[PDB]
Design a protein around this ligand. Structure first.
Ligand SMILES: OC[C@H]1O[C@H](O[C@H]2[C@H](O)[C@@H](O)[C@@H](O[C@H]3[C@H](O)[C@@H](O)[C@@H](O)O[C@@H]3CO)O[C@@H]2CO)[C@H](O)[C@@H](O)[C@@H]1O
Ligand SMILES: [Ca+2]
Ligand SMILES: [Ca+2]
Ligand SMILES: [Ca+2]
Ligand SMILES: [Ca+2]
Ligand code: NA
Length: 483
């Protein structure tokens, strides 16, 4: 069976403490539509109750300790999350946990630290003489005590921070101490992009590295996770991320599928990350996201023959996680670059019915986003489900590509003898509709095939040679399968 990942959250999921219950109630439905793995949001306590999880305070508080004025996280309590994972698991759906290791936010108090300012466009350059600041680096975990881990954090466990409480100014401060320096290797944008926001963890510190490995093993075992999504990978020492993943696999004996968020629209740089991590993890195909978005926004003028150009999936198909949109690219967000609604079903056809890549479905696209703009994503589940059924039941066997026209492009899947009635013919167009003759296999000769999306009502008959003439409406998608 073809695997399909589901991102189970959007930026504006409500702070009602019921997200784990929602997941538990949706488990049967997700298993019935073909989802094989769910990516859940950061499950540990944030700087406040309403933080989405990307400003993590305590990685060992999964919503059971009274800290930051709340027991539960935004999403719910620990026992509610364990019950949700339990329902997914009894329906053979895997669970991937979001892992936020770059920084820590919401310290309990400030400490005095000697620091220097650096050039925001070249963090290897120091731009001030050293002086004293009051930084938020003291993490004590008053509501947890020593439960699970007695480690406490201090300034010397971080490389730098962005706020001096003394002067009430925001700069990029690098701390002075024993062997203090920005980690390497990281992205070389801005000279060295180790530093991002909040208090930046120092992955040169031996105790920090050992503790974070231990935490990783604990987390996987405490929730029985099947894999991980690594946040902000380009800002974290690459060799450390390689070793951390390996240590968790060594201790659990599990495969621990892992996908890293390496946010850069450049295949060469993504390839550098795969090599530096010994190919032990996949990456999200950022470039493909931008190609799809570009196509959706040029009103038919995009050359559809170029959709694969510069993508990770054309070079390292087995290590790519393909996606249409996510919580960062949705409207109003930091990396906003939404795939226009009219093209969204065409983009889902492209990632769900092609043989390469591991495709992700966005929660926001299935159910609608609840942000406050006038351009929110509408609920598209009634248009996506038919394509997911095409992936689950027909997308098997040899593939043939027809990237031969600036608007109308298609592909076919011959089917596999072990999946009864499998096989399909897909066509998409960023402009006027039309036709294309394509080969689906001589073993399907004589069959009556129909558009499972319902966009076209006229069936097509496969000729005695295994070729059919397929049609597609303007700015639309058609996916033909056995009637
Ligand atoms: O529970 C569903 C399914 O889970 C298990 O399969 C997982 C794989 O073990 C895991 O590797 C991953 O597969 C992806 C590849 O790693 C990637 O390179 C590319 O080829 O795409 C694959 C997904 O199609 O994910 C699947 C789950 O999605 C288990 O092996 C199955 O038997 C089980 O039914
Ligand atoms: Ca360092
Ligand atoms: Ca960093
Ligand atoms: Ca075009
Ligand atoms: Ca057939
Ligand atoms: Na660092």
């Amino acid at each position: 069976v073809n695997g399909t990942l589901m991102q189970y959250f959007e930026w504006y999921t409500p702070n009602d403490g019921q997200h784990w219950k929602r997941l538990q109630n949706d488990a049967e439905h997700l298993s019935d539509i073909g989802i094989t793995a769910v990516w859940i949001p950061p499950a540990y306590k944030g700087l406040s109750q309403s933080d989405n999880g990307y400003g993590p305070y305590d990685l060992y508080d999964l919503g059971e300790f009274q800290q930051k004025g709340t027991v539960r996280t935004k999403y719910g309590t620990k026992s509610e999350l364990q019950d949700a994972i339990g329902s997914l698991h009894s329906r053979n759906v895997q669970v991937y946990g979001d892992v936020v290791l770059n920084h820590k936010a919401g310290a309990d108090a400030t400490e005095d630290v000697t620091a220097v300012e650096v050039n925001p466009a070249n963090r290897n350059q120091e731009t001030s003489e050293e002086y004293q600041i009051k930084a938020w680096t003291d993490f004590r975990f008053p509501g947890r005590g020593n439960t699970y881990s007695d480690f406490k954090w201090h300034w010397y466990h971080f490389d730098g921070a962005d706020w001096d409480e003394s002067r009430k100014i925001s700069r990029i401060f690098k701390f002075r101490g024993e062997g203090k320096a920005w980690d390497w290797e990281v992205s070389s944008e801005n000279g060295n992009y180790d530093y991002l926001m909040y208090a930046d963890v120092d992955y040169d510190h031996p105790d920090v590295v050992a503790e974070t490995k231990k935490w990783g093993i604990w987390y996987a075992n405490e929730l029985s996770l099947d894999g991980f999504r690594i946040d902000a990978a380009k800002h974290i020492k690459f060799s450390f991320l390689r070793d951390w993943v390996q240590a968790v696999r060594q201790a659990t004996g599990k495969e621990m599928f892992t996908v890293a968020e390496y946010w850069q629209n450049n295949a060469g740089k993504l390839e550098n990350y795969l090599n530096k991590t010994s190919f032990n993890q996949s990456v999200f195909d950022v470039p493909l996201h931008f190609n799809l978005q570009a196509a959706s926004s040029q009103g038919g003028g995009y050359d559809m023959r170029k959709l694969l150009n510069g993508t990770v999936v054309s070079k390292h198909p087995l290590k790519s996680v393909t996606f249409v949109d996510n919580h960062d690219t949705q409207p109003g967000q930091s990396l906003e670059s939404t795939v226009q609604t009219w093209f969204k079903p065409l983009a889902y056809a492209f990632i769900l019915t092609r043989e390469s890549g591991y495709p992700q479905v966005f929660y926001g696209d299935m159910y609608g986003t609840k942000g406050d703009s006038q351009r929110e994503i509408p609920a598209l589940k009634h248009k996506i489900e038919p394509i997911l059924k095409a992936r689950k039941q027909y997308a098997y066997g040899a593939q043939h590509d027809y990237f031969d026209h600036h608007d109308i492009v298609g592909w076919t899947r011959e089917g596999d003898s072990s999946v009864a009635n499998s096989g399909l013919a897909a066509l998409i167009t960023d402009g006027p509709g039309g036709a294309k003759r394509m080969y689906v296999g001589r073993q399907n000769a004589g069959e009556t095939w129909h558009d499972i999306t319902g966009n076209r009502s006229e069936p097509v008959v496969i000729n005695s040679e295994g070729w059919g003439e397929f049609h597609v409406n303007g700015g639309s998608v058609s996916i033909y399968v056995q009637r």
